[PDB]
Symmetry: C6
Subunit: 304 residues, 6 copies
């Protein structure tokens, strides 16, 4: 919904947004939104996501797909009427994203998802990309575990020529829904095949804010190196302004650079990861914050 | 509708158009058009805007979406007839834009929206763009507040990977409608995702004149830096001739250049803004007019 | 319809075509065709024009849109049947353009629309274009007034971010219809937004001949400077062979170059305009004919 | 239909094809096919041509459009069954082109259309093109008259911003049909607007052979000079292998080069035309044959 | 259908494939498959080919088009089932190509079509192409006659601006069907117009194998010289891997280079033709084998 | 379905994945999944694959195409419902790929398909590609036989101008289904024609994982050498990240380089093959492992 501000009320939104990443207990926003999801009546639609055609599929709080739901309309705070309707397994009226209010007035945040190695990590979409000697898949799994902490992490597998991997985009979105509805740390391996149909374009657009609103983190591996300035510059704009955080490999082997976005109109943070392999290619991230200005973000986007 | 002129009648339109920006009380046109909107019978369609498909949705004076409206026709001065009809939640006959006459004979104006720092600001579409060290989002909010003056400003949030942000284009247009129908200062953050479907192309085309007719200002942040001469030159023609004003960052950090268009066939004004940050990234515009000719507008469009 | 010629009958068509521009009373053809329009029975379709989809809308002599019209058939002098039918507000059988014969046997003319500053001006489509320090809008209005002479001129406004401007293409064509049906001098400001859908492509193709057949002049401002060899070369072919006359700005400020096409296979005329501004940006064209060969038309198309 | 040959029967086809251009009385094939058209029962479909959508319209021997025609099937010489059916004004079964056999066994000819200035001219599609100081329209009319001889020539007018010109493609094809059905010499002015929809692409493909089969000549003016290697190389392949003859202007003013194709797999002929203007731009071709090999045809296609 | 191999069974397929071109009596496979076609019950579909839309038309052994055929299913060796159904003149279930088994277990062959000048020629698609002084049409006819031997050859004429030439793609495919069903040597003049719709793309893909399976030869003339790297590289991949043999002209006038493909995974053969013209452009191929490796096939594809 | 991990459970997945390629008996996974297929009730859908339109066709354990199957629903271990439905010969609800669980919890493997010449070969998609003197077809058959070992191999033939070859994409996918359902070693000759419609794009995406999940190997020959950076870079990304293994020819004649992918996030293996020809072009691979890092995979992709 739309929000109204003056100097004073704006000043305290920023104050609150800063707190959401810098001071709030790690993982606490996810906890709060689980409670908001649990207080929804069974059967009520909570999440709608785009399938391959551009049609949307819809889910309840238990990640059950809704097949039929008679028109229901709420009156939001600004007078706006939200209309939800599912017919023959697809959405007939409504919008992609959260069909319930998780954020209320607290919008434009990067709610902290976890602290690891003395670094705070933001929820939203983290894109693991780059070019060269470093391998992305071992990193998403290693980073998934590390941000998992006490919790197990979810692994969505899509579009790779390996056993068990699903290659259907509609099963893929059905996966992501369940994961965001039920888990704080989600790994997508890989995001390559989506990058383009209507529902695929919708995913790139939508998944960052879905995850950021939930307070869960989606860590996706995206591999370019294509060198086609028709597809490599979509794997550069997606990384640019479609992700909340960005993890990109450097010239030094086993070294990665993290660019976290800390909130609406706040200063993007940076830090560097050192990594090594163990038995069966299992990667470990070692333990033992600078502000990064613009034109340095462009200078890092050397993926050609 | 079409308008007929001779030397004399044309001369006084210009006279009136000049007045609309240079001499009229700031914010006074918005006030006049609120009164025209309030004198419309409830239920009567006042605003129609394009959804993602290219179908149009329609609103009343209270920003309520119309679901069914029997065919009504109105005769003009003039000859021309206007036909309005809403069926099953969508427009069946009519046009995108204002379904009521706000402007009458006073057309081609940039009605002054506010005075700030001794500078008059035009209503219509202001696009905040550029390339480099300067951040757009803190500016649209700072400029929104400043033009707000005594009034709060509206913030439409679209297409960013942050908590609370809506990613559905149809919810987005439903936002803009409400904002223009109810508020003098509107902020859109961000315009990036719209830049392309039919309804998206329609928004760029339509929103400038909708806002200028209302006497409200829509301040949108648009970020290029893509360096793809397929998308960066649509973020150059939209900025060029789809906006009423333009705010673009310079080489000097915290400095911005404002190019106001003062009305149909009148001289575009220019001036420079100095800015600094405070607590939690809250931006302030400092306080303490040259005419800019063509080829200097092209010379400023160095976004490659 | 098709026309048959021999040496003798062809020779006198040229004789007549030359007369239509060089010797006939200025504005006299427009007068003749108003009489032909007034001698049409009420309700009978006279003009059909393409809407955005490519469907056509149809008008009577009074610029009233026709909603239902039962199939009527007219036989021509060459044994060809013209079929006209309107159903549910759209054309079901027929053709875009004049649904009545205005020209008879007198075809391929540039009927003189007005004399001003000792120069004859042709009816049809005049495109006001160019690149640099000179402003198009003040010129189309100045030139509109001047060719208006004793008469007021019509001003169609489309696709600019200013108060009152219509941004709907279907309202736009409804404007043009009325204007051509009722006025000798028409101004379109601006043609930029049309330049592409089916109905838009149809307008560029159709409007030149519609206006030339009526003997009314459509003066449209088209602004390129885009520097994209995908859109700037459509604002070069439209100017090239889609307009009857062309008015383009030069290196000298306030100076414009007029290239009139005088008729089917006749010599295109050229001349130069001097202009200055007065109060409130109101432009004046000063008072006090060379034949221009090919390759000099290409040499003038330096809009890159 | 398919044709079967051996050395002997092939040798006499070539013998006959050569005769069709080099020795047969000029215009005699057109006369023969008029007789074949006159011996068709009224109402029977003789010609089908593509409209804008790709649907086909159909005509009888008198150039009357057929609206309803019940399925009729003939058995051709090779066993093949030709099926013709018109329903609600459009073809339902059949093919574009001549729905009756005009050629029988005499196929692959360029039947001589006229002799003028001691030069034989072939029927089919003649494309008048080029770049520079020379004007195409005066030439198509001059060449139309000259090949007309004792007969008047037909003038189809399409897609120019002049009075009387039709801009609807469907009226355009309805013109061409009538002209080919009723006249030996046809002029199309101009072919520019067709060069692209389905029905337009169909015209370029189909009209050469339609005219060649009839023994009538279609002289079309096509103007490039666009310098866009997306449209200028379609105005180079159409000229190349979509026309029977080609008339192109040279560096010398008023001089044109004719490249006639004399028949299936025979030697293309060349010759040069000198021209001058008279009163009202009426062009005259002066009076007082070399074989042109390949790579010299490419060397002449200097339209960039 | 799928085929299963081991070392031994594979070794004897190659043995048989080699024999099919190198040792079998020229023209003997065509004879065998005529017998297989003659032992099909009347009415039973034998050949299905793609029309312009991508729908398929179907034929019986006598080249009669089938209009209605009730669903018939046949069991294979093998497991696999083949379903054939024709409804309202089009295929409703099935596949493009031979609806009966001509090849059985003998697949991947280039069955010898004829011996001429002491050279064996393969059946399948022969593409006659090149750039320069040499003419393609006289060659396809000369080569058609030579491979015809004791038999007449079929001539399909498509897409040229000459008398009798068909320009409708659907009549074109109806021709090819008949020709392949009834004749060993077929000539297509020309293949230029097909090179693109769905049915056209289908022809290039399908006709090589249709002809190779039948043991008939389709000799098609394809002319590029366009110099557009959007169309000239489709007249380079079609020639490359869409034809069984390739006949291309050299720098020396009247000399052509033949590249025969001798069978699945066997060595492509090469040889050179000398030619001269006689009366009425009738070409003769003179009388009085090297293996060509890869990179020499690319080195010959100099058509730019 | 989605999978949940911690440090410990992830560590043993890698342990298991490594085992699946490095230590498990060659061909043993294929054996296991045949048992899982045999324990499915007759009629139950097991495999769904995309036809040309993007619709899916469905098969039972015996490779019989399913025509009608009433909606059946199965619950997973993670609370997700799989819905399968076939109506009028096409899938109405479900997903492309295996409609039964073959992999359970053992996902992201490259199950070893065979050992040959002391080298383990992975199942999945092997693409045989390259540029130059070496021939692909003899290799896919040689490699097919060698990995076949004690078993015969299946040969799917598609899109080549040779006798017996199928050119219909729908018959093609029907082949692949049967082959994967019934055989451990499959050869596709060739993949060229698929490389683009919806169903074709789906095959590239889907076939790698289908085969890897089955534990069968699909060896496909793909030939580029096109030198068009619109099609050659799709024959570079398909080879890159759409195949499990890659076999590419080198500068030395008869020598090939094998790049095996050993499993999800494990080290890709490399080795070199020496080959020679025998009688009738039958190729033999000679008998008498290094880890290949990134940037060396790019350095090998020199196919321009
Ligand atoms: N134990 C190890 N020691 C050294 N290098 C390793 C080890 N395990 C994996 N690698 C390297 O890291 C990469 C991991 O495989 P993977 O294919 O997932 O990398 P990636 O960069 O994510 O590419 P993709 O997009 O194809 O998944 C391999 O290319 C491999 O060379
Ligand atoms: N207090 C501050 N002092 C200096 N620089 C700041 C401060 N706060 C923010 N910035 C800079 O201004 C930018 C504001 O954030 P933001 O990313 O919203 O800008 P933006 O141009 O809108 O980019 P985006 O489109 O990614 O949101 C940051 O990139 C940051 O580097
Ligand atoms: N009195 C004046 N003196 C000098 N220059 C003027 C004067 N009035 C207007 N101009 C110039 O002419 C232009 C008129 O404005 P306008 O926006 O109509 O031009 P335009 O070329 O039609 O642009 P657009 O195509 O966006 O409408 C302005 O750019 C202005 O710089
Ligand atoms: N009497 C004449 N004397 C000298 N030149 C003439 C005469 N009449 C016409 N021309 C020239 O020949 C051309 C004829 O006009 P026209 O526009 O038909 O030429 P074109 O080359 O066919 O171009 P288009 O494609 O626009 O028709 C004009 O450009 C004109 O300059
Ligand atoms: N008797 C002959 N002597 C020398 N050259 C000849 C003779 N007959 C024909 N030619 C040449 O061979 C070509 C044969 O004509 P044709 O145009 O059919 O060849 P083509 O390559 O098929 O071209 P197109 O595709 O235009 O038909 C001619 O261009 C001609 O120059
Ligand atoms: N005995 C042999 N000695 C040398 N070279 C051979 C031998 N047999 C085959 N070749 C070469 O290998 C290739 C095998 O033919 P084939 O057409 O199957 O190759 P390909 O690369 O698969 O081409 P395509 O992709 O068109 O099928 C031939 O080009 C041939 O030159």
């Amino acid at each position: 919904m739309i929000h109204l501000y003056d100097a004073k009320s704006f000043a305290k939104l920023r104050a609150a947004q800063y707190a959401a990443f810098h001071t709030d207990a790690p993982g606490s926003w996810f906890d709060h939104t689980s409670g908001v999801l649990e207080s929804v009546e069974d059967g009520t639609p909570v999440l709608a996501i785009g399938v391959e055609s551009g049609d949307a599929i819809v889910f309840d709080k238990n990640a059950q797909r809704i097949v039929a739901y008679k028109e229901k309309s709420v009156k939001a705070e600004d007078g706006s009427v939200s209309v939800v309707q599912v017919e023959n397994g697809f959405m007939k009226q409504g919008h992609r994203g959260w069909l319930v209010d998780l954020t209320g007035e607290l919008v434009g945040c990067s709610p902290v998802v976890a602290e690891f190695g003395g670094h705070r990590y933001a929820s939203g979409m983290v894109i693991v990309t780059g070019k060269g000697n470093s391998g992305k898949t071992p990193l998403v799994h290693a980073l998934g575990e590390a941000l998992g902490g006490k919790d197990k992490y979810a692994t969505v597998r899509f579009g790779e020529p390996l056993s068990g991997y699903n290659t259907d985009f509609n099963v893929f979105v059905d996966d992501i829904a369940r994961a965001m509805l039920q888990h704080r740390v989600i790994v997508i391996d890989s995001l390559k095949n989506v990058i383009i149909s209507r529902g695929a374009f919708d995913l790139l657009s939508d998944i960052g804010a879905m995850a950021a609103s939930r307070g869960c983190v989606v860590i996706a591996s995206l591999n370019p190196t294509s060198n086609d300035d028709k597809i490599v510059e979509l794997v550069k704009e997606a990384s640019r302004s479609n992700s909340t955080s960005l993890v990109i490999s450097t010239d030094v082997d086993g070294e990665w650079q993290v660019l976290t976005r800390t909130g609406e109109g706040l200063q993007a943070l940076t830090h560097t990861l050192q990594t090594s392999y163990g038995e069966h290619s299992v990667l470990t991230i070692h333990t033992s914050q600078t502000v990064i200005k613009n034109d340095e973000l462009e200078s890092v986007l050397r993926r050609l």
